[PDB]
Amino acid sequence: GTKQEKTALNMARFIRSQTLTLLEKLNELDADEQADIAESLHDHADELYRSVLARFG
Amino acid sequence: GTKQEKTALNMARFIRSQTLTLLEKLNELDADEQADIAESLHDHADELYRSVLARFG
């Protein structure tokens, strides 16, 4: 239903910003492999959020 | 330093469990494309956490 849909969109939005923050922390730490993986994680978090927005936005 | 490293590990652990929860919600909603993407997101969140654990664990 629309409230469950909105929970899921918000959580996708949230997760996308968390992964950006994690990217930033791993770059601040100069942890090169982990940063590269986190950067990919964030790109995928962004893909998920746009797709969830598209359907339930 | 070790406390910054531990912040980053915890946040990776957190993000991994959030993405599993998001996967579960999108499957509960029967939103097939978004679920497939979330499933991939979670696999990547798990890759990040293991790699961060490996380095800073």
mmCIF file of all heavy atoms in Angstrom, chain A residues 4 7-8 11-12 14-15 18-19 21-22 25-26 29-32 34 37-38 41 44-45 47-48 51-52 55-56, chain B residues 4 7-8 11-12 14-15 18-19 21-22 25 29-32 34 37-38 41 44-45 47-48 51-52 55-56:
data_model
loop_
_atom_site.group_PDB
_atom_site.id
_atom_site.type_symbol
_atom_site.label_atom_id
_atom_site.label_comp_id
_atom_site.label_asym_id
_atom_site.label_seq_id
_atom_site.Cartn_x
_atom_site.Cartn_y
_atom_site.Cartn_z
ATOM 1 N N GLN A 4 3.531 1.595 3.064
ATOM 2 C CA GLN A 4 4.621 0.655 2.903
ATOM 3 C C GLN A 4 5.567 1.064 1.765
ATOM 4 O O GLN A 4 6.773 0.907 1.892
ATOM 5 C CB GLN A 4 4.070 -0.748 2.618
ATOM 6 C CG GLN A 4 3.450 -1.475 3.871
ATOM 7 C CD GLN A 4 2.694 -2.739 3.478
ATOM 8 O OE1 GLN A 4 1.677 -2.686 2.741
ATOM 9 N NE2 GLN A 4 3.168 -3.885 3.966
ATOM 10 N N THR A 7 7.687 3.855 2.933
ATOM 11 C CA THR A 7 8.702 3.384 3.896
ATOM 12 C C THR A 7 9.891 2.929 3.083
ATOM 13 O O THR A 7 11.029 3.209 3.359
ATOM 14 C CB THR A 7 8.150 2.231 4.802
ATOM 15 O OG1 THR A 7 7.331 2.753 5.862
ATOM 16 C CG2 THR A 7 9.254 1.449 5.423
ATOM 17 N N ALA A 8 9.614 2.253 2.002
ATOM 18 C CA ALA A 8 10.669 1.672 1.228
ATOM 19 C C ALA A 8 11.438 2.704 0.450
ATOM 20 O O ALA A 8 12.618 2.525 0.208
ATOM 21 C CB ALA A 8 10.086 0.600 0.283
ATOM 22 N N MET A 11 13.660 4.594 2.986
ATOM 23 C CA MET A 11 14.779 3.748 3.342
ATOM 24 C C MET A 11 15.812 3.643 2.207
ATOM 25 O O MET A 11 17.016 3.536 2.442
ATOM 26 C CB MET A 11 14.243 2.356 3.684
ATOM 27 C CG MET A 11 15.288 1.390 4.108
ATOM 28 S SD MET A 11 14.523 0.048 5.044
ATOM 29 C CE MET A 11 15.949 -0.627 5.812
ATOM 30 N N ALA A 12 15.367 3.649 0.974
ATOM 31 C CA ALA A 12 16.298 3.716 -0.113
ATOM 32 C C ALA A 12 17.044 5.058 -0.128
ATOM 33 O O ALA A 12 18.264 5.089 -0.366
ATOM 34 C CB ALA A 12 15.609 3.507 -1.404
ATOM 35 N N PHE A 14 17.554 6.984 2.469
ATOM 36 C CA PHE A 14 18.443 6.919 3.597
ATOM 37 C C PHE A 14 19.722 6.138 3.270
ATOM 38 O O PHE A 14 20.845 6.548 3.609
ATOM 39 C CB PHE A 14 17.731 6.269 4.763
ATOM 40 C CG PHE A 14 18.573 6.140 6.021
ATOM 41 C CD1 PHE A 14 19.149 7.251 6.605
ATOM 42 C CD2 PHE A 14 18.726 4.908 6.647
ATOM 43 C CE1 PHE A 14 19.906 7.136 7.810
ATOM 44 C CE2 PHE A 14 19.434 4.774 7.830
ATOM 45 C CZ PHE A 14 20.039 5.898 8.425
ATOM 46 N N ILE A 15 19.549 4.994 2.643
ATOM 47 C CA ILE A 15 20.660 4.092 2.470
ATOM 48 C C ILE A 15 21.635 4.742 1.517
ATOM 49 O O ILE A 15 22.831 4.598 1.651
ATOM 50 C CB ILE A 15 20.202 2.719 1.892
ATOM 51 C CG1 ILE A 15 19.562 1.807 2.974
ATOM 52 C CG2 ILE A 15 21.381 2.032 1.246
ATOM 53 C CD1 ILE A 15 19.130 0.450 2.465
ATOM 54 N N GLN A 18 23.726 7.217 3.484
ATOM 55 C CA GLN A 18 24.639 6.516 4.353
ATOM 56 C C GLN A 18 25.858 5.987 3.618
ATOM 57 O O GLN A 18 26.950 5.948 4.154
ATOM 58 C CB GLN A 18 23.937 5.323 4.944
ATOM 59 C CG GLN A 18 23.051 5.663 6.100
ATOM 60 C CD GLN A 18 23.803 5.838 7.417
ATOM 61 O OE1 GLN A 18 23.867 6.957 7.964
ATOM 62 N NE2 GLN A 18 24.372 4.738 7.939
ATOM 63 N N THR A 19 25.631 5.490 2.420
ATOM 64 C CA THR A 19 26.714 4.916 1.646
ATOM 65 C C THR A 19 27.665 6.000 1.143
ATOM 66 O O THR A 19 28.851 5.751 0.980
ATOM 67 C CB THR A 19 26.249 4.102 0.420
ATOM 68 O OG1 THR A 19 25.444 4.919 -0.440
ATOM 69 C CG2 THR A 19 25.534 2.753 0.784
ATOM 70 N N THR A 21 28.225 8.827 2.838
ATOM 71 C CA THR A 21 28.978 9.081 4.083
ATOM 72 C C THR A 21 30.019 8.036 4.368
ATOM 73 O O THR A 21 31.091 8.372 4.838
ATOM 74 C CB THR A 21 28.098 9.107 5.315
ATOM 75 O OG1 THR A 21 27.298 10.276 5.278
ATOM 76 C CG2 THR A 21 28.922 9.165 6.548
ATOM 77 N N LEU A 22 29.715 6.776 4.081
ATOM 78 C CA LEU A 22 30.704 5.735 4.319
ATOM 79 C C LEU A 22 31.853 5.882 3.315
ATOM 80 O O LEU A 22 32.999 5.750 3.678
ATOM 81 C CB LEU A 22 30.068 4.336 4.293
ATOM 82 C CG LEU A 22 31.000 3.147 4.549
ATOM 83 C CD1 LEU A 22 31.857 3.422 5.732
ATOM 84 C CD2 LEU A 22 30.189 1.882 4.796
ATOM 85 N N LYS A 25 34.132 8.703 4.686
ATOM 86 C CA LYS A 25 34.948 8.180 5.793
ATOM 87 C C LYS A 25 36.090 7.242 5.373
ATOM 88 O O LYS A 25 37.198 7.255 5.982
ATOM 89 C CB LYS A 25 34.083 7.444 6.794
ATOM 90 C CG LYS A 25 33.178 8.362 7.567
ATOM 91 C CD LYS A 25 32.475 7.629 8.680
ATOM 92 C CE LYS A 25 31.558 8.611 9.430
ATOM 93 N NZ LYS A 25 32.220 9.899 9.755
ATOM 94 N N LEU A 26 35.840 6.411 4.367
ATOM 95 C CA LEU A 26 36.870 5.492 3.919
ATOM 96 C C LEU A 26 37.912 6.209 3.085
ATOM 97 O O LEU A 26 39.081 5.859 3.153
ATOM 98 C CB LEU A 26 36.281 4.370 3.120
ATOM 99 C CG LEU A 26 35.589 3.282 3.938
ATOM 100 C CD1 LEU A 26 34.657 2.526 3.024
ATOM 101 C CD2 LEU A 26 36.648 2.383 4.604
ATOM 102 N N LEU A 29 40.076 8.020 5.564
ATOM 103 C CA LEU A 29 41.016 7.060 6.156
ATOM 104 C C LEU A 29 42.122 6.608 5.201
ATOM 105 O O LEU A 29 43.024 5.902 5.640
ATOM 106 C CB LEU A 29 40.300 5.784 6.649
ATOM 107 C CG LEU A 29 39.387 5.820 7.890
ATOM 108 C CD1 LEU A 29 38.541 4.550 7.945
ATOM 109 C CD2 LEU A 29 40.165 6.002 9.145
ATOM 110 N N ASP A 30 42.032 6.994 3.930
ATOM 111 C CA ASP A 30 42.955 6.536 2.859
ATOM 112 C C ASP A 30 43.029 5.010 2.665
ATOM 113 O O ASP A 30 44.123 4.426 2.489
ATOM 114 C CB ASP A 30 44.359 7.046 3.120
ATOM 115 C CG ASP A 30 45.218 6.980 1.911
ATOM 116 O OD1 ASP A 30 44.771 6.474 0.866
ATOM 117 O OD2 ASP A 30 46.363 7.427 2.010
ATOM 118 N N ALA A 31 41.861 4.376 2.698
ATOM 119 C CA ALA A 31 41.772 2.937 2.648
ATOM 120 C C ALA A 31 41.298 2.611 1.250
ATOM 121 O O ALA A 31 40.102 2.588 0.988
ATOM 122 C CB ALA A 31 40.803 2.456 3.715
ATOM 123 N N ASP A 32 42.241 2.398 0.343
ATOM 124 C CA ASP A 32 41.958 2.559 -1.074
ATOM 125 C C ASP A 32 41.005 1.495 -1.669
ATOM 126 O O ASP A 32 39.991 1.819 -2.309
ATOM 127 C CB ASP A 32 43.265 2.734 -1.864
ATOM 128 C CG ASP A 32 44.236 1.603 -1.663
ATOM 129 O OD1 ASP A 32 43.933 0.737 -0.787
ATOM 130 O OD2 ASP A 32 45.284 1.593 -2.388
ATOM 131 N N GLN A 34 38.798 -0.265 -0.067
ATOM 132 C CA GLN A 34 37.530 -0.290 0.576
ATOM 133 C C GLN A 34 36.768 0.874 -0.002
ATOM 134 O O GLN A 34 35.561 0.768 -0.272
ATOM 135 C CB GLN A 34 37.731 -0.188 2.076
ATOM 136 C CG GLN A 34 38.241 -1.462 2.766
ATOM 137 C CD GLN A 34 39.659 -1.820 2.409
ATOM 138 O OE1 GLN A 34 40.480 -0.954 2.195
ATOM 139 N NE2 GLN A 34 39.936 -3.096 2.332
ATOM 140 N N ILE A 37 35.317 -0.037 -3.471
ATOM 141 C CA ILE A 37 34.115 -0.805 -3.229
ATOM 142 C C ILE A 37 32.929 0.050 -2.704
ATOM 143 O O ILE A 37 31.815 -0.088 -3.183
ATOM 144 C CB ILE A 37 34.416 -1.992 -2.238
ATOM 145 C CG1 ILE A 37 35.492 -2.934 -2.806
ATOM 146 C CG2 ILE A 37 33.151 -2.781 -1.940
ATOM 147 C CD1 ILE A 37 35.898 -4.134 -1.895
ATOM 148 N N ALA A 38 33.153 0.898 -1.709
ATOM 149 C CA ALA A 38 32.115 1.803 -1.213
ATOM 150 C C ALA A 38 31.563 2.719 -2.278
ATOM 151 O O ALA A 38 30.366 3.062 -2.227
ATOM 152 C CB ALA A 38 32.599 2.639 -0.034
ATOM 153 N N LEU A 41 29.257 0.670 -4.182
ATOM 154 C CA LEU A 41 28.090 0.504 -3.336
ATOM 155 C C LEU A 41 27.131 1.726 -3.446
ATOM 156 O O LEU A 41 25.899 1.574 -3.643
ATOM 157 C CB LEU A 41 28.552 0.283 -1.914
ATOM 158 C CG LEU A 41 27.446 0.061 -0.901
ATOM 159 C CD1 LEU A 41 26.544 -1.082 -1.312
ATOM 160 C CD2 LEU A 41 28.061 -0.205 0.478
ATOM 161 N N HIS A 44 25.260 1.910 -6.767
ATOM 162 C CA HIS A 44 24.159 0.950 -6.686
ATOM 163 C C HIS A 44 23.058 1.423 -5.735
ATOM 164 O O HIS A 44 21.884 1.262 -6.049
ATOM 165 C CB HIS A 44 24.660 -0.484 -6.363
ATOM 166 C CG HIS A 44 25.366 -1.132 -7.520
ATOM 167 N ND1 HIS A 44 26.739 -1.130 -7.661
ATOM 168 C CD2 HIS A 44 24.873 -1.695 -8.663
ATOM 169 C CE1 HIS A 44 27.069 -1.713 -8.810
ATOM 170 N NE2 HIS A 44 25.958 -2.055 -9.435
ATOM 171 N N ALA A 45 23.392 2.023 -4.592
ATOM 172 C CA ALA A 45 22.365 2.588 -3.742
ATOM 173 C C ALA A 45 21.539 3.662 -4.472
ATOM 174 O O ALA A 45 20.313 3.756 -4.254
ATOM 175 C CB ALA A 45 22.983 3.204 -2.477
ATOM 176 N N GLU A 47 21.208 3.869 -7.878
ATOM 177 C CA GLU A 47 20.394 3.124 -8.843
ATOM 178 C C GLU A 47 19.089 2.624 -8.177
ATOM 179 O O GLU A 47 18.008 2.868 -8.668
ATOM 180 C CB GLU A 47 21.186 1.934 -9.404
ATOM 181 C CG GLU A 47 20.381 1.094 -10.391
ATOM 182 C CD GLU A 47 21.158 -0.062 -10.927
ATOM 183 O OE1 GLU A 47 22.331 -0.240 -10.491
ATOM 184 O OE2 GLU A 47 20.603 -0.770 -11.799
ATOM 185 N N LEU A 48 19.200 1.972 -7.024
ATOM 186 C CA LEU A 48 18.003 1.510 -6.290
ATOM 187 C C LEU A 48 17.022 2.652 -5.960
ATOM 188 O O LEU A 48 15.812 2.553 -6.208
ATOM 189 C CB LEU A 48 18.395 0.739 -5.028
ATOM 190 C CG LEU A 48 17.234 0.105 -4.227
ATOM 191 C CD1 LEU A 48 16.352 -0.843 -5.075
ATOM 192 C CD2 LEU A 48 17.776 -0.607 -2.959
ATOM 193 N N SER A 51 15.122 3.974 -8.991
ATOM 194 C CA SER A 51 14.204 2.995 -9.518
ATOM 195 C C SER A 51 12.978 2.892 -8.602
ATOM 196 O O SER A 51 11.873 2.801 -9.081
ATOM 197 C CB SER A 51 14.853 1.639 -9.662
ATOM 198 O OG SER A 51 13.843 0.656 -9.788
ATOM 199 N N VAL A 52 13.189 2.911 -7.295
ATOM 200 C CA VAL A 52 12.079 2.910 -6.322
ATOM 201 C C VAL A 52 11.259 4.228 -6.461
ATOM 202 O O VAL A 52 10.058 4.210 -6.421
ATOM 203 C CB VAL A 52 12.626 2.687 -4.826
ATOM 204 C CG1 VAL A 52 11.551 2.992 -3.790
ATOM 205 C CG2 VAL A 52 13.192 1.305 -4.623
ATOM 206 N N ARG A 55 8.919 4.053 -9.533
ATOM 207 C CA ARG A 55 7.746 3.183 -9.343
ATOM 208 C C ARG A 55 6.768 3.709 -8.302
ATOM 209 O O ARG A 55 5.546 3.681 -8.479
ATOM 210 C CB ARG A 55 8.183 1.767 -8.937
ATOM 211 C CG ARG A 55 7.068 0.673 -9.128
ATOM 212 C CD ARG A 55 7.604 -0.754 -9.122
ATOM 213 N NE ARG A 55 6.567 -1.795 -9.254
ATOM 214 C CZ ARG A 55 6.800 -3.092 -9.567
ATOM 215 N NH1 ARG A 55 8.028 -3.544 -9.805
ATOM 216 N NH2 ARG A 55 5.788 -3.957 -9.658
ATOM 217 N N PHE A 56 7.293 4.202 -7.208
ATOM 218 C CA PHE A 56 6.437 4.591 -6.121
ATOM 219 C C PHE A 56 6.443 6.105 -5.891
ATOM 220 O O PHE A 56 5.622 6.618 -5.147
ATOM 221 C CB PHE A 56 6.887 3.891 -4.834
ATOM 222 C CG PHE A 56 6.875 2.395 -4.914
ATOM 223 C CD1 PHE A 56 7.823 1.645 -4.247
ATOM 224 C CD2 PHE A 56 5.889 1.729 -5.637
ATOM 225 C CE1 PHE A 56 7.795 0.274 -4.310
ATOM 226 C CE2 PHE A 56 5.869 0.358 -5.705
ATOM 227 C CZ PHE A 56 6.824 -0.365 -5.053
ATOM 228 N N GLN B 4 38.167 5.876 14.394
ATOM 229 C CA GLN B 4 37.643 6.155 13.073
ATOM 230 C C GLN B 4 37.447 4.874 12.251
ATOM 231 O O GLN B 4 36.470 4.764 11.523
ATOM 232 C CB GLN B 4 38.592 7.095 12.317
ATOM 233 C CG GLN B 4 38.549 8.595 12.799
ATOM 234 C CD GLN B 4 39.685 9.417 12.199
ATOM 235 O OE1 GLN B 4 40.887 9.148 12.454
ATOM 236 N NE2 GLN B 4 39.326 10.428 11.409
ATOM 237 N N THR B 7 34.416 3.144 13.465
ATOM 238 C CA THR B 7 33.193 3.857 13.045
ATOM 239 C C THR B 7 32.841 3.337 11.672
ATOM 240 O O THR B 7 31.722 3.035 11.345
ATOM 241 C CB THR B 7 33.402 5.409 13.037
ATOM 242 O OG1 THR B 7 33.309 5.951 14.365
ATOM 243 C CG2 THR B 7 32.383 6.093 12.194
ATOM 244 N N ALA B 8 33.843 3.168 10.853
ATOM 245 C CA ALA B 8 33.604 2.798 9.492
ATOM 246 C C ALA B 8 33.183 1.360 9.359
ATOM 247 O O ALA B 8 32.442 1.026 8.452
ATOM 248 C CB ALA B 8 34.869 3.075 8.652
ATOM 249 N N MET B 11 29.524 1.145 10.585
ATOM 250 C CA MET B 11 28.659 1.694 9.561
ATOM 251 C C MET B 11 28.523 0.754 8.351
ATOM 252 O O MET B 11 27.474 0.681 7.710
ATOM 253 C CB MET B 11 29.237 3.038 9.111
ATOM 254 C CG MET B 11 28.423 3.735 8.083
ATOM 255 S SD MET B 11 28.829 5.495 8.085
ATOM 256 C CE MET B 11 27.447 6.119 7.202
ATOM 257 N N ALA B 12 29.570 0.046 8.007
ATOM 258 C CA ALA B 12 29.443 -0.957 6.992
ATOM 259 C C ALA B 12 28.527 -2.102 7.450
ATOM 260 O O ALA B 12 27.700 -2.590 6.661
ATOM 261 C CB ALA B 12 30.769 -1.491 6.616
ATOM 262 N N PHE B 14 26.164 -1.868 9.703
ATOM 263 C CA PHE B 14 24.843 -1.300 9.704
ATOM 264 C C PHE B 14 24.227 -1.290 8.300
ATOM 265 O O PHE B 14 23.050 -1.639 8.099
ATOM 266 C CB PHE B 14 24.903 0.111 10.247
ATOM 267 C CG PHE B 14 23.561 0.823 10.296
ATOM 268 C CD1 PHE B 14 22.497 0.280 10.990
ATOM 269 C CD2 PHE B 14 23.397 2.066 9.698
ATOM 270 C CE1 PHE B 14 21.249 0.969 11.070
ATOM 271 C CE2 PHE B 14 22.205 2.766 9.784
ATOM 272 C CZ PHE B 14 21.108 2.215 10.474
ATOM 273 N N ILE B 15 25.008 -0.855 7.335
ATOM 274 C CA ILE B 15 24.465 -0.615 6.021
ATOM 275 C C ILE B 15 24.079 -1.952 5.434
ATOM 276 O O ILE B 15 23.103 -2.065 4.723
ATOM 277 C CB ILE B 15 25.500 0.086 5.090
ATOM 278 C CG1 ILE B 15 25.616 1.607 5.377
ATOM 279 C CG2 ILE B 15 25.118 -0.158 3.649
ATOM 280 C CD1 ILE B 15 26.588 2.336 4.475
ATOM 281 N N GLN B 18 20.697 -2.923 6.843
ATOM 282 C CA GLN B 18 19.666 -2.084 6.284
ATOM 283 C C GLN B 18 19.263 -2.507 4.882
ATOM 284 O O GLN B 18 18.114 -2.400 4.496
ATOM 285 C CB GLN B 18 20.182 -0.673 6.180
ATOM 286 C CG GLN B 18 20.132 0.077 7.473
ATOM 287 C CD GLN B 18 18.750 0.636 7.803
ATOM 288 O OE1 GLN B 18 18.106 0.194 8.775
ATOM 289 N NE2 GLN B 18 18.287 1.613 7.005
ATOM 290 N N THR B 19 20.248 -2.893 4.097
ATOM 291 C CA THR B 19 19.986 -3.275 2.724
ATOM 292 C C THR B 19 19.253 -4.613 2.656
ATOM 293 O O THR B 19 18.481 -4.846 1.737
ATOM 294 C CB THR B 19 21.253 -3.396 1.851
ATOM 295 O OG1 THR B 19 22.165 -4.338 2.430
ATOM 296 C CG2 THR B 19 21.947 -2.023 1.541
ATOM 297 N N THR B 21 17.135 -5.625 5.038
ATOM 298 C CA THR B 21 15.774 -5.169 5.385
ATOM 299 C C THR B 21 15.062 -4.508 4.239
ATOM 300 O O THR B 21 13.870 -4.705 4.081
ATOM 301 C CB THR B 21 15.755 -4.149 6.503
ATOM 302 O OG1 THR B 21 16.108 -4.794 7.714
ATOM 303 C CG2 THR B 21 14.395 -3.581 6.674
ATOM 304 N N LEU B 22 15.782 -3.733 3.437
ATOM 305 C CA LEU B 22 15.136 -3.092 2.301
ATOM 306 C C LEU B 22 14.771 -4.152 1.256
ATOM 307 O O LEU B 22 13.700 -4.109 0.694
ATOM 308 C CB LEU B 22 16.003 -1.962 1.723
ATOM 309 C CG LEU B 22 15.428 -1.190 0.530
ATOM 310 C CD1 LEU B 22 14.016 -0.817 0.802
ATOM 311 C CD2 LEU B 22 16.243 0.071 0.273
ATOM 312 N N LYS B 25 11.493 -5.809 2.498
ATOM 313 C CA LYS B 25 10.357 -4.913 2.227
ATOM 314 C C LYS B 25 9.940 -4.819 0.752
ATOM 315 O O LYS B 25 8.723 -4.705 0.427
ATOM 316 C CB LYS B 25 10.651 -3.512 2.720
ATOM 317 C CG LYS B 25 10.688 -3.418 4.219
ATOM 318 C CD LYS B 25 10.791 -1.985 4.675
ATOM 319 C CE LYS B 25 10.833 -1.949 6.214
ATOM 320 N NZ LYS B 25 9.804 -2.809 6.849
ATOM 321 N N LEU B 29 6.514 -6.250 -0.906
ATOM 322 C CA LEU B 29 5.685 -5.419 -1.787
ATOM 323 C C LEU B 29 5.476 -6.014 -3.181
ATOM 324 O O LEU B 29 4.700 -5.454 -3.948
ATOM 325 C CB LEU B 29 6.288 -4.012 -1.985
ATOM 326 C CG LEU B 29 6.288 -2.984 -0.837
ATOM 327 C CD1 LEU B 29 7.240 -1.838 -1.172
ATOM 328 C CD2 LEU B 29 4.919 -2.477 -0.547
ATOM 329 N N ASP B 30 6.171 -7.105 -3.494
ATOM 330 C CA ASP B 30 6.173 -7.726 -4.845
ATOM 331 C C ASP B 30 6.613 -6.797 -5.992
ATOM 332 O O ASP B 30 6.004 -6.780 -7.087
ATOM 333 C CB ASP B 30 4.797 -8.268 -5.178
ATOM 334 C CG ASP B 30 4.829 -9.241 -6.299
ATOM 335 O OD1 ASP B 30 5.901 -9.463 -6.890
ATOM 336 O OD2 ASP B 30 3.763 -9.780 -6.605
ATOM 337 N N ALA B 31 7.669 -6.033 -5.732
ATOM 338 C CA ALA B 31 8.131 -5.030 -6.660
ATOM 339 C C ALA B 31 9.380 -5.606 -7.288
ATOM 340 O O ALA B 31 10.470 -5.460 -6.751
ATOM 341 C CB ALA B 31 8.405 -3.738 -5.907
ATOM 342 N N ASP B 32 9.211 -6.295 -8.407
ATOM 343 C CA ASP B 32 10.197 -7.276 -8.831
ATOM 344 C C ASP B 32 11.551 -6.679 -9.284
ATOM 345 O O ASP B 32 12.626 -7.075 -8.805
ATOM 346 C CB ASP B 32 9.579 -8.255 -9.843
ATOM 347 C CG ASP B 32 8.991 -7.570 -11.046
ATOM 348 O OD1 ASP B 32 8.949 -6.302 -11.020
ATOM 349 O OD2 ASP B 32 8.586 -8.309 -12.002
ATOM 350 N N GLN B 34 12.813 -3.819 -8.414
ATOM 351 C CA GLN B 34 13.447 -3.054 -7.396
ATOM 352 C C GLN B 34 14.077 -4.064 -6.473
ATOM 353 O O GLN B 34 15.202 -3.863 -5.990
ATOM 354 C CB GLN B 34 12.411 -2.183 -6.711
ATOM 355 C CG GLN B 34 11.942 -0.957 -7.509
ATOM 356 C CD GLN B 34 11.126 -1.300 -8.727
ATOM 357 O OE1 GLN B 34 10.385 -2.260 -8.724
ATOM 358 N NE2 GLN B 34 11.276 -0.522 -9.768
ATOM 359 N N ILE B 37 17.416 -5.354 -7.944
ATOM 360 C CA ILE B 37 18.413 -4.347 -7.652
ATOM 361 C C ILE B 37 18.827 -4.302 -6.155
ATOM 362 O O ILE B 37 20.006 -4.240 -5.847
ATOM 363 C CB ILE B 37 17.915 -2.930 -8.126
ATOM 364 C CG1 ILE B 37 17.634 -2.915 -9.639
ATOM 365 C CG2 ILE B 37 18.936 -1.856 -7.785
ATOM 366 C CD1 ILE B 37 17.102 -1.568 -10.221
ATOM 367 N N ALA B 38 17.871 -4.297 -5.235
ATOM 368 C CA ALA B 38 18.172 -4.343 -3.803
ATOM 369 C C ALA B 38 18.978 -5.555 -3.402
ATOM 370 O O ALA B 38 19.799 -5.460 -2.470
ATOM 371 C CB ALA B 38 16.912 -4.274 -2.950
ATOM 372 N N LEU B 41 22.384 -4.788 -4.377
ATOM 373 C CA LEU B 41 22.859 -3.815 -3.412
ATOM 374 C C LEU B 41 23.362 -4.507 -2.110
ATOM 375 O O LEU B 41 24.477 -4.217 -1.606
ATOM 376 C CB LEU B 41 21.745 -2.834 -3.128
ATOM 377 C CG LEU B 41 22.091 -1.727 -2.152
ATOM 378 C CD1 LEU B 41 23.320 -0.965 -2.596
ATOM 379 C CD2 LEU B 41 20.892 -0.781 -2.005
ATOM 380 N N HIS B 44 26.668 -6.363 -2.544
ATOM 381 C CA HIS B 44 27.727 -5.354 -2.515
ATOM 382 C C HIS B 44 27.929 -4.778 -1.111
ATOM 383 O O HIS B 44 29.067 -4.576 -0.704
ATOM 384 C CB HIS B 44 27.514 -4.256 -3.592
ATOM 385 C CG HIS B 44 27.784 -4.745 -4.987
ATOM 386 N ND1 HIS B 44 26.789 -5.187 -5.835
ATOM 387 C CD2 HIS B 44 28.962 -4.980 -5.637
ATOM 388 C CE1 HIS B 44 27.331 -5.622 -6.969
ATOM 389 N NE2 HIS B 44 28.643 -5.513 -6.869
ATOM 390 N N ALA B 45 26.866 -4.529 -0.346
ATOM 391 C CA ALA B 45 27.043 -4.103 1.027
ATOM 392 C C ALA B 45 27.832 -5.135 1.852
ATOM 393 O O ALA B 45 28.644 -4.747 2.717
ATOM 394 C CB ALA B 45 25.683 -3.856 1.700
ATOM 395 N N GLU B 47 29.976 -7.454 0.516
ATOM 396 C CA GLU B 47 31.350 -7.362 0.015
ATOM 397 C C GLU B 47 32.119 -6.238 0.750
ATOM 398 O O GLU B 47 33.183 -6.462 1.287
ATOM 399 C CB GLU B 47 31.350 -7.096 -1.497
ATOM 400 C CG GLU B 47 32.754 -6.954 -2.078
ATOM 401 C CD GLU B 47 32.744 -6.691 -3.546
ATOM 402 O OE1 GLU B 47 31.623 -6.573 -4.119
ATOM 403 O OE2 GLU B 47 33.853 -6.629 -4.126
ATOM 404 N N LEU B 48 31.542 -5.043 0.817
ATOM 405 C CA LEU B 48 32.179 -3.927 1.550
ATOM 406 C C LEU B 48 32.470 -4.265 3.024
ATOM 407 O O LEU B 48 33.583 -4.053 3.526
ATOM 408 C CB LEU B 48 31.350 -2.646 1.431
ATOM 409 C CG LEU B 48 31.963 -1.375 2.062
ATOM 410 C CD1 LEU B 48 33.376 -1.045 1.521
ATOM 411 C CD2 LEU B 48 30.999 -0.171 1.900
ATOM 412 N N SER B 51 35.345 -6.725 3.503
ATOM 413 C CA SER B 51 36.612 -6.151 3.119
ATOM 414 C C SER B 51 37.076 -5.161 4.195
ATOM 415 O O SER B 51 38.236 -5.134 4.529
ATOM 416 C CB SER B 51 36.529 -5.455 1.781
ATOM 417 O OG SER B 51 37.639 -4.589 1.643
ATOM 418 N N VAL B 52 36.164 -4.362 4.725
ATOM 419 C CA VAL B 52 36.479 -3.435 5.829
ATOM 420 C C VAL B 52 36.866 -4.248 7.101
ATOM 421 O O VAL B 52 37.788 -3.905 7.792
ATOM 422 C CB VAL B 52 35.257 -2.425 6.100
ATOM 423 C CG1 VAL B 52 35.432 -1.681 7.418
ATOM 424 C CG2 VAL B 52 35.048 -1.460 4.961
ATOM 425 N N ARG B 55 40.488 -5.568 6.818
ATOM 426 C CA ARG B 55 41.519 -4.532 7.001
ATOM 427 C C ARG B 55 41.560 -3.966 8.412
ATOM 428 O O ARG B 55 42.624 -3.753 9.003
ATOM 429 C CB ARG B 55 41.305 -3.376 6.011
ATOM 430 C CG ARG B 55 42.563 -2.449 5.828
ATOM 431 C CD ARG B 55 42.502 -1.575 4.580
ATOM 432 N NE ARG B 55 43.652 -0.666 4.415
ATOM 433 C CZ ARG B 55 43.976 -0.018 3.271
ATOM 434 N NH1 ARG B 55 43.265 -0.169 2.157
ATOM 435 N NH2 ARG B 55 45.039 0.788 3.229
ATOM 436 N N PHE B 56 40.402 -3.721 8.974
ATOM 437 C CA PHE B 56 40.355 -3.059 10.249
ATOM 438 C C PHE B 56 39.837 -3.974 11.360
ATOM 439 O O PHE B 56 39.927 -3.635 12.530
ATOM 440 C CB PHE B 56 39.448 -1.826 10.156
ATOM 441 C CG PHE B 56 39.883 -0.821 9.133
ATOM 442 C CD1 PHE B 56 38.951 -0.091 8.423
ATOM 443 C CD2 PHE B 56 41.233 -0.582 8.900
ATOM 444 C CE1 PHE B 56 39.356 0.841 7.499
ATOM 445 C CE2 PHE B 56 41.635 0.345 7.969
ATOM 446 C CZ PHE B 56 40.700 1.045 7.265
#
